[PDB]
Amino acid sequence: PDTVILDTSELVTVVALVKLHTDALHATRDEPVAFVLPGTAFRVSAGVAAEMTERGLARMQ
Numbered sequence: 001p002d003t004v005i006l007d008t009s010e011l012v013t014v015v016a017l018v019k020l021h022t023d024a025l026h027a028t029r030d031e032p033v034a035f036v037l038p039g040t041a042f043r044v045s046a047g048v049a050a051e052m053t054e055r056g057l058a059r060m061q
Helices: 046-055
Strands: 012-016 041-044 058-060
Touching: 012 046, 041 046, 046 058
Parallel strands: none
Antiparallel strands: 012 041, 012 058
């Protein structure tokens, strides 16, 4: 291949628990994400969320 893009139209809901700057672009909707706050629920890729929840800064709503 030559794309290296994991997109299965399966967005995951995740809300940040602490002031963290995440880079997630809405796939199903039209709203980019460059920075989230502790209490806001933002949707990200299935692979991205894996790192978010693993970082201990964000939790899946």
